[model samples]
Target chain A: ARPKLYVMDNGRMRMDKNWMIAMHNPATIHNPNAQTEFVEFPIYTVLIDHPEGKILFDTSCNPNSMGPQGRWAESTQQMFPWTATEECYLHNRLEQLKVRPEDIRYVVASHLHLDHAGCLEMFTNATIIVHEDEFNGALQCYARNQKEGAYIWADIDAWIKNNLQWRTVKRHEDNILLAEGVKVLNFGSGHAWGMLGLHVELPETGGIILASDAIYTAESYGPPIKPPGIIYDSLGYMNTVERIRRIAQETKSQVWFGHDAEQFKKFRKSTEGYYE
Target chain B: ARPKLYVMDNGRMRMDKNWMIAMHNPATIHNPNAQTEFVEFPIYTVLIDHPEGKILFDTSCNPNSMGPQGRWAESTQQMFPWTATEECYLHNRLEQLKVRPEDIRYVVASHLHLDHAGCLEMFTNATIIVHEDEFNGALQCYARNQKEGAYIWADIDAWIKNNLQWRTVKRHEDNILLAEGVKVLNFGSGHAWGMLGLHVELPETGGIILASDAIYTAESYGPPIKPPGIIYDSLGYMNTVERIRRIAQETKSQVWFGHDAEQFKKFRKSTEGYYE
Candidate 1:
């Protein structure tokens, strides 16, 4: 039987229009010259209710992300501009799912971005599966104070604590089986260095692909796939999208984009019901 | 039978001599006129091999406390300069003791000071026992920018995650039993607000009193106990020292000073052997 998957409403973030789609091209949906419209993307955490073990994908932004003094660096807070309600916290979301944190055996980190890794520290007991290159790049960014774009010092510092079991996914071509039907495909540095994509095969639901950040929106996933505005490697990012397209075609999987605001509205949120 | 106790060397902190012992006093050992010397205190996390379950006393300081970028505020880091080698980290210390953090069933927080609560986030699986007043006071201090000495914003932020089991210890006249033969005696904030001292009875080693911060040295634990230069309440500090003395006398336990360099040298570290 396939594991029950629930899309938790972790929260949302406000970002500039150019940050999402293409910055300035006339052909692109996002016009660089137009007045900046603040776009809000619903941040979420995916919970897989596997028969063997429970798995959580991403941790979402920290509750105290914009606290009294603000947890993040001034630049970081300004760039992301995150906010969340009391009900949208990771702990509360987990509680709503009726699963204790201790019960979750594995936590898959799509990428150690600030919002994604916010509550990763909370799941110290669970084995955190992250790409080896991603971990190394983050460490380098933190140690040298490189002022990297997406990587935040506060979030990456938790992984350094050494309490959490970090299973670094090296250059593996095949899908790494996290559970019975849950297979992970490593799309190294597509959006960010060492980004991981998951393909879970369910009994009733068949196969589903969670392409976090690799394919930001359906508009970007075009006939002649357009590169995201925040591209680390244009070629690698393009190749990553094609890989997702092929996987979705072969396995007959439904593709879920990372931060597509319109797409997020369609998903059966934790508040409504579980997607088994 | 009492649990076998192992003093795991987490790290060490370099601080001003005046900040720890008496500073500005002609009558005190630390002459007001003498040149300043940086004193080092061996920070540690105690491992109890209890019959019921394994218990960890105190979490020591966070690894990133004195990182390249610096985790703590500038003033905070300067006042209490901390440093540690890779071997001295909390995880490595636990590994040296042949214990995994997941094995620790209960973690007793002496107080919510920066160093004390540094690694608390690491032990989210374990039930964290903290004095109610201590938890409340730390929150208040963090919420409002209260320069309450050692209570750092970064360290306090970890506690507010709201995932771990926070067993709030209220005002109790007698000692509170955490596990079999393991008890915590509240000293009522002599050093910091709601500071707690631990008592562990071993069949082989007899009674042991962990006077954390409440009593700093043999000089402070005198017949006419000298108040610490950096003290919150003079009368409460005196009372706490007396309480430790009384507990030591009644139980015939050896009193362990919080940051006494001389006293730390006497006790056998984790490398030597376990105190059963």
Candidate 2:
């Protein structure tokens, strides 16, 4: 059984352009007035069916993650409104591939943000892998019981209520191999408290680095490296970008951005076919 | 006014000696059978009365944190049984100094272990400062809803219920100035996910480094530093010990151990006098 990578499109988010690429640089004399722009953030998850087990990466937002009574706070919903059809839902997308939530062996979270870890409670049987710092950060924010940034308390409470198993990867434990040709990359404290990326080496696809949030888009991953406006550690973000670039180069892998709509459109969704 | 350091004796715990010094080494050839010894761990908190405001370090254990119906699990209670007199309670000790919980301006936790951050909910008005990783780690453990190490769910629930304001200090944010002559040292991850130490410069006492669990005792802070058994990152623990040694040498600071019973007896309690 050869390892197969299936890019599943969960949904899309409507957000300000500056949130993806920090375009508010008034100091630049060339562009005196940069107009505000809206962009579509394509939210997706990767499913890697290996010889060992079915490994999942970054569970997308929950079905009811928008509007007034959704998991997200009012300010969050206003800032980044989400939209998804019934077919685009995470469970539905998985069902399309004939994979159930219980079938997943390991679910690696890129980072525990509202968009990234919303449906984490669904995969109760799988060992949810997350960066130690990121896991801790989200819990800390949830424990504060305050509306802190992008962390939704309801989602965290759901995970707790479900009693999902979590295995945290430490900062030092970078590039941990989960299965044959599958590695978990730990990019500590950047877009969120801590970010984990997936590196899958498929026979047909060669190599693919699922650099979720660490590199939001090609513009954000420029040679000059303009960080996202919604960044926790600016220096850490820049460092992670450079590190991902180096890793991509070293492995000759295709770097998959987290929320790049144009780039996401090019990739074959689960309905189209698998990447193997 | 000069910053006064008041050491408050909270309570004590009985644990295996190896838990402190990691004394089990059967391959030493000199001694084949090493008998397990028991030791008394003296828990204490420091109150820094500065010109700016009153700063508290490590809240100690809750009054009802042992036995069957206590916060701690049965296994935890058996391994490390706790005992405290009525007068030794955190609130009572603070009352001895005529200080209310609301009077504290800053509440800095060394780490969020069961014994270290037990009474954190009391000081609702104070800004709680903890290491970013430590704060996150505890929350992660609590969210998992499992008995992980020394993290008590009840403590975390209480913290969330009380709505305490948290200010997490990052790894790179080393030696952050809290007051004029007081600094908070960021000790990455060692005994816990992240350990923070306080360094205070006084008129009479010169300098004191309140190294919480980073160095459990004078033995753990030996020339050839030995780490405690209940450590998360052993390499990190050794590195932190060396770092503390360098910092203590550089500042000519008196190193205060976290659970050193002999050392605890030497220091003047809140009822006696303060170090300034």
Candidate 3:
């Protein structure tokens, strides 16, 4: 059986413009007249129906991420508020394609941020793959009970409570093949402590690089790479972007941005059709 | 100038025999007549004098770690009571060789256990190389103020306060060359969240794989591959042992155990002479 790719739209988020792209620099090197701008980001997940089994990437935000009693802290909600319809929920989106949680063979987490790994606990049957440093960093943040950043203790608690299986990718690992024509790009440390990107090769579509947060948008992935404000390792971020560019060039793949609203509108959602 | 190797004796620790080896089991599989045994472990550090510069491996325990106003907690002191003379201290040992802290070019930590990283703060001039996971895990434990394990908050605090430089090795990296004949082994995770080992190739002494904690003693590095009681990832531990074995065999190097008392006695101390 040939492999097919489906782009699943979970929801959207509204965050500061600088957070997405470092527009305002106190150094006066760039954007001297940068204004405080708020921008909308498209949060989407990917579903891959391969000959081996089904592979899912980035679970998206939990349905109950907002509200007073929600999993996200009030401070986090204020900075990056989530918006989603009943049909936009991850499980609901999966159900639209008649895919159950048990059918998923692997769940590759780009990074364990609130918007990316909210529904990770639900996939008990699948092996959850994450970068080792990201796994350790998130748990460390959770242990310290610090809710200042993207990590939320409530989400981590649920993952632990459910006893999910995890397979962490190490720093030295480059393109680790999950199956034939499918690989996970280990982009060591960048936007987060550790970040992973997916590379899927479809018979008809050729190649597709699902660069989640590693390259947030085409603006972030310019000839001269511009890093996001919320970056762990600036050098790592630039290096990953260069690596992705090289990989895309070599594989002749179309690079998919993490939260590119304009790009999201261009792609065919899971409800419409799939790339084969 | 040919590179030379020196073994600096730190001190010793008394730990449970079960903690060293899996001797007792309720299933009555291994040792039926096993009694609770406590054994002494020798903690030592390695200094390599290369043509480029001096490289130190595993800084021994801190001298001010046993008293009432010690860096270590009371519970920790009781569990692993440190015993060392003035000469046994890491700084003192370096001084014995007429080497100042500034002379060292690199400090490679096998793992960030209390005993291994107590004197890491002193090496401000040197680049501290450690496994990425161990570095993050130590900071995480410190952030949470969790002192139950081998990590000490005081040590971490000192490192941050000193503004020491660090180069963390990734999990997929193997035998990262620091100098011409010296390489750092990245043993993903086993005894700790992350572990690193040093490999030195000397003109006269040939090659040596300093398998710290990854292989505690000769018994632990048995043909049957017996693991220590205090293991994080059992599979990783076993895999590391095999990898070390292969590297030793292929490179024709000697495997130096982490804390083996009997083996420690066989080696010539730095005060006596040097291996070159």
- Model 1 over residues A69-114: C-alpha lDDT tens digits? 7567755666567778889999999997788888888898898877
| Model 3 alpha-carbon drift over 4 Å, by segment | A1-276, B24-34
Expressed as tens digits, the lDDT of each residue in B1-276 for candidate 2 is 688889999988876665676533211112222234456789899999888999999999988788778988876776677789999899999998999999999999999988889999999999999999988888988889967458888899999999999999987885779998899999988788899999999988898999999999988898768667666666578788999899999989999999988899999999899998
**For model 1 chain A, where is the 10-residue window of minimal lDDT?**
A24-33
TM-score of chain B of each: 0.91, 0.96, 0.95
Model 1 clash pairs?
A: A189-A194
> Every prediction's TM-score for the first chain?
0.92, 0.95, 0.95
Q: Write the per-residue lDDT of candidate 3 for residues A161-248, one digit (tens) a residue.
A: 9999999998787677899888988988878989999988888888999999999998899877876756666657878899999989
Candidate 1 global CA lDDT score: 0.76
TM-scores, one per candidate: 0.48, 0.51, 0.51
Q: Report the lDDT of model 1 for residue A186.
A: 90
Using Cα atoms, each model's DockQ against the true complex is: 0.01, 0.01, 0.01
Candidate 2 positional error at B49, Å: 1.4
After superposition, the stretches of candidate 2 with alpha carbons farther than 4 Å from their true spots are A1-276, B25-33
**Which numbered prediction scores highest in TM-score against the true structure?**
2
For candidate 2, state the interface root-mean-square deviation in angstroms to 1 decimal. 30.2
User: Number of clashing pairs, model 3?
Assistant: 0
Q: Is the docking of candidate 1 incorrect, acceptable, medium or high quality?
A: incorrect
